[PDB]
Design goal:
The structure is a homodimer. Chain A has helices at about 30, 40-45, 60-75, 100-105, 125-135, 205-220, 240-260, 280-285, 300-305, 310-320; strands spanning about 10-20, 25-30, 50-55, 85-90, 115-120, 145-150, 170-180, 190, 200, 235, 270-275, 295, 330-335, 340-345. Helices cover about 30% and strands about 25% of the residues of chain A. Chain A has two domains: about 1-180, Thiolase/Chalcone synthase (Peroxisomal Thiolase, Chain A, domain 1); about 185-349, Peroxisomal Thiolase, Chain A, domain 1, CATH 3.40.47. Chains A, B: Its EC number is 2.3.1.180. Chains A, B: This is Beta-ketoacyl-[acyl-carrier-protein] synthase III. Chains A, B: Belongs to the thiolase-like superfamily. FabH family.
Amino acid sequence: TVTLKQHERPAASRIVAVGAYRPANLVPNEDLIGPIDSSDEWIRQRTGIVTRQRATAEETVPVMAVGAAREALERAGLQGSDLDAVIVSTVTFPHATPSAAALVAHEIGATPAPAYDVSAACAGYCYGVAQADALVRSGTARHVLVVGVERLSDVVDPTDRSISFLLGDGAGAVIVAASDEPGISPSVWGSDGERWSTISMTHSQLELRDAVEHARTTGDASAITGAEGMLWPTLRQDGPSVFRWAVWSMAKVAREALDAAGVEPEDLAAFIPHQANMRIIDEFAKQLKLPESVVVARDIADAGNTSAASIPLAMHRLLEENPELSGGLALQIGFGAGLVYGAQVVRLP
Amino acid sequence: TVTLKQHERPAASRIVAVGAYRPANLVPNEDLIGPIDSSDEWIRQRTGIVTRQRATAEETVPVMAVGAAREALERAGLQGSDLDAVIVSTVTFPHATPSAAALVAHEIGATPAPAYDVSAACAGYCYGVAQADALVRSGTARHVLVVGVERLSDVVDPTDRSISFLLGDGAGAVIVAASDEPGISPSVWGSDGERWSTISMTHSQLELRDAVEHARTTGDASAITGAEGMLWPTLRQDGPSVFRWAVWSMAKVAREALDAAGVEPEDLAAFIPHQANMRIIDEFAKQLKLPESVVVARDIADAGNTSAASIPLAMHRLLEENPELSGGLALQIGFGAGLVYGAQVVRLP
């Protein structure tokens, strides 16, 4: 009987660099308040957001992912061809198939590395890291690129007061590499599909299909011309439910991640939650009983909520503003539509 | 100072069961030839297809995925709560977010297992297996559900001669578990994003957005009525390039998988390529110098090309027809839009 061969496995893994792409357009509250009939001060008070990154038409998911990817590559002292896998976490690339990852892999010179997109909403980067970590520690890959990237502005309804004005665009990239010393703690990640509808689109793409093609065939374009709300599906959320879950449920996940890591809040150099909402971030930090020395990421004030991009973008900003955090421990925890969540303690690059 | 804890790792991984969902509506060539001005004969000679599976409106991606998954759990002697991760490979779930995996995980009682959709086209199941293998051998998961599932009928154009009549609907699933004996060989997987447009949608979802919202907000519904051709994006391909690529390139990837497995064609119980086209299957078989004793999967003749679902469906069928293949080595290889590909040698459950 034949025994199958197997890859050898390194001791551990580690994030060896972080890269960022931020659209230059920082939209202020005032530009958005009209159609949702609110105000600069209300938005600032409810969400702590002042400006959000808004991408132009040319700044597509692949464009943004590539820029972030290239910065990470340069900071790691690597090139595209050194990558053994490319994971792109996004829900806004406007093609069912093929993936954005395959374009990214090609553009950055990673061919022929395997390349795929992942769907895990705002937890997407942390899901990416769990996967990358698994790929490295099983000896499947020595260097894995993970990109959290979104052009959320493509799926907001300007009249929506549940989520539209919170969302921004951008890309954040990380490179996970084989390592001698543990740099990524065991992932704590999960789902609760019972609550699939808590953050979701207004309706299925098939409704859009059925309408447009019925209009096209029959020549009757009512139902479209007479439509009061957008037919293009857009993002929506039960705001209050998100808050209760985001804070009081995720706090248990974070403590679990710390516990599995073998780490106390005192050992952290930084706390980098997904940038969902300043109110969520604050209440979260309080619940974790962090000492004053732990730096809390609050990129959301200038970037808005960039979903999968949010954590690596905030990590990137943390390191620029405090270079001495490099080598320190950071708790990262993302959470979004699904519902899904993921967390790790990581040694910062 | 502080050393992060790490998970213990299993010696190996293996597939422990396979489940299937096949829509009952088998559609013969005759029902399709009209709009493409073709024939039964032409279709059989070009593709080897006699009928393809076609889902009803009720047979959504989650519904099919759930049926396949439940069969796999039952055959493995497991319940949903035994699963530590759920991976769904699909490109036809009609929601940008949240994922189909989140719903599937809930229906089967796998909550709170992490759950995500992967985008890797027809190589989707093979990508999923490589991921599942990494998750297990890294000790991140001990039981991983992988489901390739598509309702391709949602994204075909009945007038399209390049791919429409080739495609069928369905779900196949496997459970990958921690193992003492190697049951999954090192994956050979990759991408060539330079040929991203080789198999692609007719156009971006954004063009659909711009057309419908414009019509909705101006009342001018031209461009929708009197649009020749579908506004709803549909799948298409450059057939001769896909074929050329399969024979020039994928045959070689398949040999590499044997090499990396430490396995000869004489050692195979079965060959289970992605069911792209009967002629490609047959060319592969010849090109790989398979002995007569190796059973070749040809589910395509009855199911059509079910993309990500094709390998596990075909596997399910081989085991139903040749129960004694259980425990034998099977070479599986998927390849599709991206371009992307994956292959492994696997021990049949």
